[PDB]
């Protein structure tokens, strides 16, 4: 029946699934991994070992454990990010939703859920394949990563710790869907690996990885490189926050195997309660427990292996959202507030400048300053309020990616640049947010074709569009219909750089995305810091 | 008899001049200084002794020792700026222009030339001081001071050559008006000094030295002033180009005598020879000779000065040309010539940048060139070459102005700023140099005023309008005339901050003058240069 699957790992049984009028089928919650519990906590993850019997995948499995945002309690615009299943370390799962009937060997699409590596669940009602599943045709895969400590500790030199066991987790669902997913019907030769934030973060990675290159075919970033400043630490940098967290837990800090058997007795509630407690300035978009560049996922340093051109050589296709900043100002900079327009002093300009760039010195934050104040204005707080929104999104998300962008271009086979700045008409955040980092996944997600969410036409032809143009790259690397009559997306090439602005508008192209200020963050600001 | 004058060093006859179908009188050429030659070459001038007789002040002196332009020969352009009288070491006179019939005590103008220093001459066509004289009703003086290395050259320690003396023979006229002007009908309580680029610094710098304040009322400077970097030097830095103008010339350098020896056994046009060749950078808008921090006629640095109020308090009225840097672009900047569009290239915006800021490191050239950078245009020519008018007019003209208004204002007696944007429309300089430094001085001198030299009808309302607030400052500290119509040039104050626009179309008031690259120039750029 169509409902049941034979794979290598076993038998699987799925359920039928309603979508807009129609159904197709979904199997929720199948094992990839051996559940990385006890001993296993920090380790590398194990291959499931195969069942008897036939596996229910009828029902979303647990969220792996995580620090669950309780700022704006009932608020369903924090919430909707938040776990909605029961949390557990035994929580490395994947889903697949897969058009009815069962193709034979169609375009697969695999969702990386962001969260800053720290949080993040495959079973938010924002990432429900079902929309893209059916409308598309393809079949959707979310997996699972283990986040935190539990994910991202690093003790290199342990075996026992070694750091980047999250990606680790991802690659190892991907080996599986590589392994298995033909008999749901999908085409393990046309795998797009697509995700936000840490999640387009974790793309990039793979790209680089030499571990990972081959289980996919192209790849889709959305807000995340891999290169951004807080996607990584170094490994010296990872033992000092393990050996703090140990410190915060009043471990035994001799030697790491006393460490790691100590981190292992606690409770995974006690980890999480100390976790923000080990980031070595005051901060804001910098997370604890992140990859590490440890030699061996990654063999040299980003910013060599992109140079050098050691990466997957593919199509790609990427992009940010217009006000990227916002959300982390919000909850980690004065002056903010959800309730409020948030005029920005002066003073809290400084101190937002400041938390943004917490590893500059003085010269390096008047460089900033200067950089993003209208001197002919300067106690305009909605000026400041919105300057320090460009600092964060251009500093942690947009001019990372740029730089990735220009870099890949060199050696890869097809890079497409998006812009999304359409702000959506029921959007619960205040407007002073804009369009917020993470906003675009309902219309990449189809959320705007259910009437009862309170999208407008417009949102969901924007969606339609979106969705398309994410399905026909991952299908041909190339997001437009061939010989269609609608505006094509360009190219992005090395010479003109062009992209388009995704939105309800009729098409437009530019040049050069944010360069003025990349010149800045990518060029001009590090050569400062390196030199004083 | 009306062109009879008895003084104090004696009788003066001076000529009876036509202008605009009347007449004044003019007594030019009289001597204010023994003439510094000889063993007096290099010092402090001294007091012209009195003479017997009747000194025939019927036609202009001499011009000083002074670098000739060359550069274009017969080109009205810059033979305009050029001496029209022979070439003297014996210079040091003064002309003045009274009314006719002569007044009882009216106000004073001195006028004081540019010339960076190296150049300049009273006697030139577009000083002549009769148009004003007339139209204002004002008695107009102008004096000379000795440029280059005889004005200048700079031996701290040593009396015989102690640098500043073409300050000091300024300072001399200056005390020569006020002891005798009375005697020509003007006010010696209502003296305002005025002057141009070198000209502007030096009256900046009579407000700043204590042996000079008190010889003047008021003060005017148009697009210079005395912390401009090319105004002075060290006495260290002035002291190694005294030597190596010695060397230049095959002198003996083992003391301070035997180097002033032989410069003074030296014919003027050897000195001239090699004046260039002691810069210390590879530079452009440097001079050899100009004034040195000598703990005498600045008793502290410039800025010290400034920031504690060490300076005379009173009115001044000041400005700035919109593009004072295209002159020392086009002598001195490859790419740029005078009879093309003179687009630059990147490679040669790139040169221009290190000409322009010779004392920066590789980080501060960086930091110059991306904040005058469109990178999203980078290789448009006129971008570049537009780009480098305003690097230097700011770094050079527009940006010490204002830090020198800014610092002014807070005990000063009233400010007014100017900016002037006026292109005559019978310039004879290409367009790509725009409002070239020195093109207002003949809007100030009332030269629109002759029917022959081929102005416009509006360009002698906006000469007469100037010349009137110049004179309306000069006479009452406030360049408006109380009471009456026409729109106020309102008062510079360091909360608001405003000027006006000088040209022919309707009065605009603004506020905070180039205030975004002035803060990179006075505040970032040298921040950076101190810690790298
Ligand atoms: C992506 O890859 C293919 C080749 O691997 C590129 O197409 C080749 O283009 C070269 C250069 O024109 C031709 O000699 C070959 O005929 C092409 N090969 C094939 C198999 O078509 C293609 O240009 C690349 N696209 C981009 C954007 O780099
Ligand atoms: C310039 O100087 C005069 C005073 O020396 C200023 O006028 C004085 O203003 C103070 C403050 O209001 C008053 O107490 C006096 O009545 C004024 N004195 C005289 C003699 O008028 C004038 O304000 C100053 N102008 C500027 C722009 O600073
Ligand atoms: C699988 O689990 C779901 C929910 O727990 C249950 O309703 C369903 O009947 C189960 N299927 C079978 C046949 O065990
Ligand atoms: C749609 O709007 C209504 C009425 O304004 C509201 O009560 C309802 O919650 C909205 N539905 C959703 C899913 O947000
Ligand atoms: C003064 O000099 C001028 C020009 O050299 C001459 O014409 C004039 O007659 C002289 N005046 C007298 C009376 O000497
Ligand atoms: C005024 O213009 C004429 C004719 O174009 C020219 O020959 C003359 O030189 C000009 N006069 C001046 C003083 O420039």
Redesign the interface.
Same mark, same amino acid.
């Given at each position: 029946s169509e409902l049941l699957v034979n794979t290598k790992s076993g038998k699987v049984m799925g359920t039928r699934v309603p979508v807009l009028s129609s159904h197709i089928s979904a199997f929720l919650g199948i094992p990839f991994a051996e559940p990385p519990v006890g001993n296993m906590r920090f380790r590398r993850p194990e291959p499931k070992k195969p069942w008897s019997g036939v596996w229910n995948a009828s029902t979303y499995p647990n969220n792996c454990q995580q620090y669950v945002d309780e700022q704006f309690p009932g608020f369903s615009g924090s919430e909707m990010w938040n776990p909605n299943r029961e949390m557990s370390e035994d929580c490395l799962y994947l889903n697949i939703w897969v058009p009815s009937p069962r193709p034979k060997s169609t375009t697969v699409m695999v969702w990386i859920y962001g969260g800053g590596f720290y949080s993040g669940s495959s079973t938010l009602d924002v990432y429900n394949g079902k929309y893209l599943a059916y409308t598309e045709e393809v079949v959707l895969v979310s997996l699972s990563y283990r986040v935190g400590a539990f994910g991202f500790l690093a003790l290199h030199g342990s075996q026992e710790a070694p750091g980047n066991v999250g990606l680790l987790d991802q690659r190892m669902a991907l080996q599986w869907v590589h392994d298995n997913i033909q008999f749901f019907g999908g085409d393990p030769k046309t795998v797009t690996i697509f995700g936000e934030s840490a999640g387009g973060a974790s793309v990039g990675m793979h790209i680089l990885s030499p571990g990972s290159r081959d289980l996919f075919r192209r790849a889709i970033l959305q807000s995340g490189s891999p290169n951004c400043p807080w996607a990584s630490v170094s490994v010296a940098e990872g033992r000092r926050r393990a050996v703090e967290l140990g410190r915060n837990l009043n471990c035994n800090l001799n030697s790491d195997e006393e460490l790691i058997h100590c981190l292992r007795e606690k409770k995974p509630q006690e980890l999480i309660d100390v976790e923000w407690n080990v980031l070595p300035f005051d901060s804001i978009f910098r997370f604890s427990f992140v990859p590490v560049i440890d030699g061996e996922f990654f063999p040299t340093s980003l910013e060599s292996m992109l140079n050098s051109g050691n990466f997957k050589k593919t199509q790609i296709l990427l992009g940010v959202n217009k006000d990227e900043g916002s959300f982390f100002l919000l909850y980690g900079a004065p002056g903010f507030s959800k309730d409020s327009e948030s005029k920005i002093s002066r003073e809290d300009f400084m101190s937002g400048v400041k938390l943004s760039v917490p590893h500059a010195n003085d010269?390096g934050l008047?460089?900033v300053t200067?950089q993003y104040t209208?001197?002919?204005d300067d106690n305009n707080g909605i000026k400041n309020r919105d300057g320090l929104d460009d600092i964060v999104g251009d500093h942690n998300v947009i001019c990372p990616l740029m730089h990735f962008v220009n870099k890949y271009t060199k050696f890869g086979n097809g890079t497409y640049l998006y812009f999304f700045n359409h702000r959506a008409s029921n959007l619960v955040w205040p407007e002073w947010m804009g369009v917020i980092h993470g906003y675009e996944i309902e219309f990449v997600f189809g959320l705007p074709l259910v009437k009862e969410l309170n999208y407008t036409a417009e949102e969901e032809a924007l969606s339609r569009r979106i969705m398309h143009y994410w399905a026909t790259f991952a299908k041909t690397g190339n997001p437009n219909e061939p010989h269609s009559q609608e505006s094509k997306w360009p190219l992005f090439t090395t010479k003109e750089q062009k992209f388009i602005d995704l939105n309800t508008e009729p098409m437009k192209v530019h &040049?050069?995305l944010r360069?003025?200020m990349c010149?800045?963050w990518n &060029?001009?600001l590090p050569?400062?810091l390196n030199?004083?």
């Amino acid at each position: 029946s169509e409902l049941l699957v034979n794979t290598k790992s076993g038998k699987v049984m799925g359920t039928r699934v309603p979508v807009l009028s129609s159904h197709i089928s979904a199997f929720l919650g199948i094992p990839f991994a051996e559940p990385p519990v006890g001993n296993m906590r920090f380790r590398r993850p194990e291959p499931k070992k195969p069942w008897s019997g036939v596996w229910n995948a009828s029902t979303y499995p647990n969220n792996c454990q995580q620090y669950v945002d309780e700022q704006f309690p009932g608020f369903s615009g924090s919430e909707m990010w938040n776990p909605n299943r029961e949390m557990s370390e035994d929580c490395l799962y994947l889903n697949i939703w897969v058009p009815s009937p069962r193709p034979k060997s169609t375009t697969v699409m695999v969702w990386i859920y962001g969260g800053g590596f720290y949080s993040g669940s495959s079973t938010l009602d924002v990432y429900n394949g079902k929309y893209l599943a059916y409308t598309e045709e393809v079949v959707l895969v979310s997996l699972s990563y283990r986040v935190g400590a539990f994910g991202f500790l690093a003790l290199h030199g342990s075996q026992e710790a070694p750091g980047n066991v999250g990606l680790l987790d991802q690659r190892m669902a991907l080996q599986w869907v590589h392994d298995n997913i033909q008999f749901f019907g999908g085409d393990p030769k046309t795998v797009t690996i697509f995700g936000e934030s840490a999640g387009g973060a974790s793309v990039g990675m793979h790209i680089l990885s030499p571990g990972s290159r081959d289980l996919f075919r192209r790849a889709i970033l959305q807000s995340g490189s891999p290169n951004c400043p807080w996607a990584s630490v170094s490994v010296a940098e990872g033992r000092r926050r393990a050996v703090e967290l140990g410190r915060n837990l009043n471990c035994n800090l001799n030697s790491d195997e006393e460490l790691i058997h100590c981190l292992r007795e606690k409770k995974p509630q006690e980890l999480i309660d100390v976790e923000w407690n080990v980031l070595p300035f005051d901060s804001i978009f910098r997370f604890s427990f992140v990859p590490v560049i440890d030699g061996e996922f990654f063999p040299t340093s980003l910013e060599s292996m992109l140079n050098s051109g050691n990466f997957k050589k593919t199509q790609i296709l990427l992009g940010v959202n217009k006000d990227e900043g916002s959300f982390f100002l919000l909850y980690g900079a004065p002056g903010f507030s959800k309730d409020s327009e948030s005029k920005i002093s002066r003073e809290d300009f400084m101190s937002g400048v400041k938390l943004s760039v917490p590893h500059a010195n003085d010269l390096g934050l008047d460089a900033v300053t200067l950089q993003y104040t209208d001197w002919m204005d300067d106690n305009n707080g909605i000026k400041n309020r919105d300057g320090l929104d460009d600092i964060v999104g251009d500093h942690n998300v947009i001019c990372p990616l740029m730089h990735f962008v220009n870099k890949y271009t060199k050696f890869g086979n097809g890079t497409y640049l998006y812009f999304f700045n359409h702000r959506a008409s029921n959007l619960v955040w205040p407007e002073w947010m804009g369009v917020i980092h993470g906003y675009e996944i309902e219309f990449v997600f189809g959320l705007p074709l259910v009437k009862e969410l309170n999208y407008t036409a417009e949102e969901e032809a924007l969606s339609r569009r979106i969705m398309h143009y994410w399905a026909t790259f991952a299908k041909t690397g190339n997001p437009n219909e061939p010989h269609s009559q609608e505006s094509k997306w360009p190219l992005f090439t090395t010479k003109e750089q062009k992209f388009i602005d995704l939105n309800t508008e009729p098409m437009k192209v530019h &040049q050069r995305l944010r360069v003025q200020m990349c010149v800045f963050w990518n &060029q001009f600001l590090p050569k400062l810091l390196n030199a004083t």
